[PDB]
Structure 1
Amino acid sequence: ASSVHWFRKGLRLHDNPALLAAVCVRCVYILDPWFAASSSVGINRWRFLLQSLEDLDTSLRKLNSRLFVVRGQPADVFPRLFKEWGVTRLTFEYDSEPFGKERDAAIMKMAKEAGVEVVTENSHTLYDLDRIIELKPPLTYKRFQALISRMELPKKPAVAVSSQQMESCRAEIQENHDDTYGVPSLEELGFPTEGLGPAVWQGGETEALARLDKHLERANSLLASPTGLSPYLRFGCLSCRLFYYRLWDLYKKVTPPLSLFGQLLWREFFYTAATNNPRFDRMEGNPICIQIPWDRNPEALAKWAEGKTGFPWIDAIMTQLRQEGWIHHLARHAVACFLTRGDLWVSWESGVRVFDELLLDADFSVNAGSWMWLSCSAFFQQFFHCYCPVGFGRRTDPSGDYIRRYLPKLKGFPSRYIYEPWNAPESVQKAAKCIIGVDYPRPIVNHAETSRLNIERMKQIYQ
């Protein structure tokens, strides 16, 4: 048959169900390079996508095929491409997200009218999210535990695709193909590349599967680790089911507690809650979200996103996120708490956008979920689960080296004062050679006063 596998997501060949289903097969990614020119998402996540797409082309080229990166909007492209190659069927991995499902319903219909078969497999999640909802979406991590404990075990990693079977259905190779359907570049997509150094989080399934093996084998915690698999799970370079059962296999050599699958269940929990929540990213029109009257301060958001709040632990976290695309989960609770219920009283929706632009592992599902969790807007009620913009830093890194690596103007400050610089002697400031209100910004709020007011406003919302 003439089958098209849409690698819109799950940028992997290992544990790929729809790949085996479609197996003449042509692997397509559809990218609108003008949408990409006007994207608010920064260079780090766009680079990850391209590098991941480059890896599958490299992998497909090993199997005598190539990745067809078609340009344009998907609904306009598929019918002409259907007629161009006489596509017998189109196979794409199912998208839990509502906006994707609405787009996928239109393509599945357009194929139905056009007589093209459509097969969808949701290898992005460990389990069916729609199963759990019938069993209203689970609104607590515990009730969600309870429904997955009543649910069957998640599916095991999927089967491989043979090199001989792939050669049998290898697609037509043209010399012009590397230019026609070749993977785009950052400069093609509107990004300036001058001075761009080697990426901290290299994209692709090859890197991910390599990091899998390195991770299982084993303050710096806050720095990027070669073990880190957060972005590779978000794009699909690594399977949720492979990571689940390879972790299970290591535990058996070392019955599983929930603690190993915490990243995946927290991931799953938000994926379940969002499939049928259309405004999941928004406060209004959202059944699960508390209608908190969040203030609008455009200048606070700016100082928060631009790493200039005066609080070194906050500003160093935002600086790493801007520069590298990944911060530690405890660092995210820090900056989320500062922006929302802890200090600035700005909507979690504003934080969802900044993270979507800068963070490699942001989804519609995982991002809005975490932000509703911190803000105590949903799933969560412990409005005292509080983080000091000073104390949390000194407790995570007493050395202050994290600040020194990402805010080097404060490098000379001694550890006793590096998380709280306004409260430091001008003697030690001048020795550090960092001015109190020139070289670095001063605290834009006072945390003690502000935090007290915000709980009081928070408690009144519960009634």
Structure 2
Amino acid sequence: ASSVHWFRKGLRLHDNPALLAAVRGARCVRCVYILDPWFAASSSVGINRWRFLLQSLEDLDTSLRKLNSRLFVVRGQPADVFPRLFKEWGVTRLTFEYDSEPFGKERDAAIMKMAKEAGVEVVTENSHTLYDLDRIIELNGQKPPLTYKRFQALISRMELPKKPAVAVSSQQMESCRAEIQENHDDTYGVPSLEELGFPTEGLGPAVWQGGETEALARLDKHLERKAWVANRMNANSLLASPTGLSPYLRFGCLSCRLFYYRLWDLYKKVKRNSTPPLSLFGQLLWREFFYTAATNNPRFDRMEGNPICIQIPWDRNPEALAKWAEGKTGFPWIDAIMTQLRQEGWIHHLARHAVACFLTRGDLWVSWESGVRVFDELLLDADFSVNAGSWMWLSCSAFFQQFFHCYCPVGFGRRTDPSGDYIRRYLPKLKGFPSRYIYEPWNAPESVQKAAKCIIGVDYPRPIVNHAETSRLNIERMKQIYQQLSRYRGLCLLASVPSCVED
């Protein structure tokens, strides 16, 4: 069996049953990653994501050398690359980890049709998510749960997620090690940022190193018993922890089930004789919840044609969008967030809310689809389901939430880090301002602006909205929207919010 294994996500060798399947059969095994290098000059992805990806691939490549095989990086489209590769390798069996996402699913349907009528058998596993998303929906009467609390009610009545699959051994690697073509496997070699057309100059090391090896180490540190034992938000947390797992999850450099059980195990050994609360797994469960909600909704990342999304009249405004995208709003908190975003590829979820809210219902009133697109380009952990998900949640567009909670571009920031040292890390044209005025530079006397060598209106821009008058405007608009949706005639705002299936 000349079996090809196909990485898309699931960029790892641990808990990769699709790969166990490519292998169980003997004959030849090649691991490939199709990559579209001229779709890669396209802006749909910044350096940080691309760089994260190549490093995952390089690590994979390295991991495969340790198994006397190598990583095959073919270039172009899956369709009309798999054909040519089929003949050329006399391929027998193609395997990959299942993709629940609408586009992915469709893509994969075509690929498997085009494999049947060509003699190649296909085997898929689902190891990107904790459960079979399809089962969860079956059990919920063939509809996805549309609130997290309902999502939890259900999971709590369900069986535990499968345990992580063991990795393939060398043992069965030679049993199908391929003949790598010497100085030509580097016509299948992992490209470089320069190659994909990226200015590489004064880069510096990635804040989030890519690949399974890094992911596995971060896991162990993350779970180091007493460091872990913590559960009041910090501020230190705004900075990219070296134990954060989110990008590895999104790329599949880290198996989500592994993470699940190692979590379980440690909790067992700490709180002892006990079964833990679902909140322990909060990070993994929200992910599942967005995945589950997204599999059968191909318009999931849009407003129109999206059955779960409330139609809200956002204004198209590339001017305001740009100011937000570029960290040129007057608000240090907001601009500090967006700067760290663009720079490193990760920002704490509390900062995601601040920034998401500022853009949607809090201030700019720009559509959430636009926030999605910017995050898709900059945020390492933002895939289709999870990113559309949070944006619909945050803009109060879906999932039946309450819209009265405000994220102040000044207050919320000062309260999550009064010291101002976050702002002083990313907005350094403000080193000099005292904490007293740094969340609100324009409210400092010129005597203080000058001692800080920063003149609001010059060195740093002035706020682009009066938050108060905006707050008042946007609250009203939500009010109306939820009112005509509940048909609630009445004067309270907690009552305009439906809590499940429309009315």
TM-score normalised to structure 1 length: 0.98
Provide the secondary structure at the position in 2 that maps to 1:290: coil
Provide the secondary structure at the position in 2 that maps to 1:74: coil
The CA deviation at 1:362 is: 0.6
- Paired position in structure 1 for 2:9: 9
Provide the secondary structure at the position in 1 that maps to 2:31: strand
Moved more, 31-40 or 102-111: 31-40
Map Cα deviations across residues 93-127 of structure 1 (whole Å, 9 max, x no partner). 11010001000000000001111101111100000
- Cα distance in 2 between the residues matched to 1:120 and 1:369: 25
- Cα distance in 2 between the residues matched to 1:385 and 1:263: 22
Provide the secondary structure at the position in 2 that maps to 1:35: coil
- Cα distance in 1 between the residues matched to 2:79 and 2:336: 42
Residue 247 (structure 1) aligned to one of 263, 285, 288:
263
Map Cα deviations across residues 338-390 of structure 1 (whole Å, 9 max, x no partner). 00011110110000000000000010000000000000001142102221110
Map Cα deviations across residues 308-367 of structure 1 (whole Å, 9 max, x no partner). 100000000000000000000000000000000111101100000000000000100000
Provide the secondary structure at the position in 2 that maps to 1:422: helix
- 8 Å CA contact retained: 2:314, 2:366: yes
Map Cα deviations across residues 71-107 of structure 1 (whole Å, 9 max, x no partner). 1111101011111111111001110100010000000
- Cα distance in 2 between the residues matched to 1:38 and 1:404: 33
- Paired position in structure 2 for 1:212: 219
Unaligned 5+ segments in structure 1 are: none
Residue 112 (structure 2) aligned to one of 78, 83, 108:
108
- Cα distance in 1 between the residues matched to 2:56 and 2:447: 51
Q: Do residues 52 (structure 1) and 56 (structure 2) align? A: yes
- Cα distance in 2 between the residues matched to 1:134 and 1:452: 43
Residue 77 (structure 1) aligned to one of 76, 81, 85:
81
Provide the secondary structure at the position in 2 that maps to 1:154: coil
- 8 Å CA contact retained: 2:31, 2:70: yes
Map Cα deviations across residues 251-293 of structure 1 (whole Å, 9 max, x no partner). 0001111222111001000000000000100000011111111
Q: Do residues 193 (structure 1) and 200 (structure 2) align? A: yes
Unaligned 5+ segments in structure 2 are: 226-235, 482-502
Provide the secondary structure at the position in 1 that maps to 2:415: helix
Provide the secondary structure at the position in 2 that maps to 1:120: strand
What is the number of residues matched between the two proteins?
461
The CA deviation at 1:151 is: 2.3
Provide the secondary structure at the position in 1 that maps to 2:356: helix
- 8 Å CA contact retained: 2:219, 2:243: yes
- Cα distance in 2 between the residues matched to 1:371 and 1:200: 25
The CA deviation at 1:236 is: 0.3
- Cα distance in 2 between the residues matched to 1:33 and 1:298: 28
- Cα distance in 2 between the residues matched to 1:39 and 1:318: 17
Map Cα deviations across residues 127-153 of structure 1 (whole Å, 9 max, x no partner). 011112222221000111122123221
The CA deviation at 1:160 is: 1.6
- 8 Å CA contact retained: 2:329, 2:335: yes
The CA deviation at 1:177 is: 3.0
- Cα distance in 2 between the residues matched to 1:166 and 1:372: 45
Moved more, 385-394 or 61-70: 385-394
Provide the secondary structure at the position in 2 that maps to 1:226: coil
Moved more, 278-287 or 152-161: 152-161
Show the 5 A alignment for 1:285-304.
285-304=305-324
Provide the secondary structure at the position in 2 that maps to 1:69: strand
Show the 5 A alignment for 1:20-169.
20-23=20-23, 24-135=28-139, 136-169=143-176
Moved more, 87-96 or 161-170: 161-170
Provide the secondary structure at the position in 2 that maps to 1:75: coil
- Paired position in structure 1 for 2:238: 222
- 8 Å CA contact retained: 2:72, 2:185: no
The CA deviation at 1:422 is: 1.2
- Cα distance in 1 between the residues matched to 2:119 and 2:166: 29
The CA deviation at 1:163 is: 1.2
- Cα distance in 2 between the residues matched to 1:240 and 1:381: 27
Provide the secondary structure at the position in 2 that maps to 1:37: coil
Residue 324 (structure 1) aligned to one of 344, 351, 358:
344
The CA deviation at 1:174 is: 1.9
Provide the secondary structure at the position in 2 that maps to 1:33: coil
Map Cα deviations across residues 21-41 of structure 1 (whole Å, 9 max, x no partner). 010110000011111112331
TM-score normalised to structure 2 length: 0.90
Alpha-carbon RMSD = 1.0
- Cα distance in 1 between the residues matched to 2:130 and 2:109: 22
Provide the secondary structure at the position in 2 that maps to 1:314: helix
Q: Do residues 393 (structure 1) and 400 (structure 2) align? A: no
Provide the secondary structure at the position in 2 that maps to 1:91: strand
Map Cα deviations across residues 22-63 of structure 1 (whole Å, 9 max, x no partner). 101100000111111123310000000000000010000011
- 8 Å CA contact retained: 2:328, 2:335: yes
Residue 237 (structure 1) aligned to one of 253, 256, 266:
253
Q: Percent identity?
A: 100
The CA deviation at 1:238 is: 0.2
- Cα distance in 2 between the residues matched to 1:120 and 1:20: 11
Map Cα deviations across residues 156-213 of structure 1 (whole Å, 9 max, x no partner). 1112211121122111122123421100111111111011111100001000001000
- Cα distance in 2 between the residues matched to 1:445 and 1:37: 35
Provide the secondary structure at the position in 1 that maps to 2:347: coil
- Cα distance in 2 between the residues matched to 1:58 and 1:341: 46
- Cα distance in 1 between the residues matched to 2:44 and 2:292: 27
Residue 183 (structure 2) aligned to one of 164, 171, 176:
176
Moved more, 35-44 or 171-180: 171-180
Provide the secondary structure at the position in 2 that maps to 1:398: coil
- Cα distance in 2 between the residues matched to 1:407 and 1:336: 19
- Cα distance in 2 between the residues matched to 1:51 and 1:142: 37
Provide the secondary structure at the position in 1 that maps to 2:223: helix
- Cα distance in 2 between the residues matched to 1:273 and 1:317: 28
- Cα distance in 1 between the residues matched to 2:469 and 2:73: 54
- Cα distance in 1 between the residues matched to 2:429 and 2:311: 40
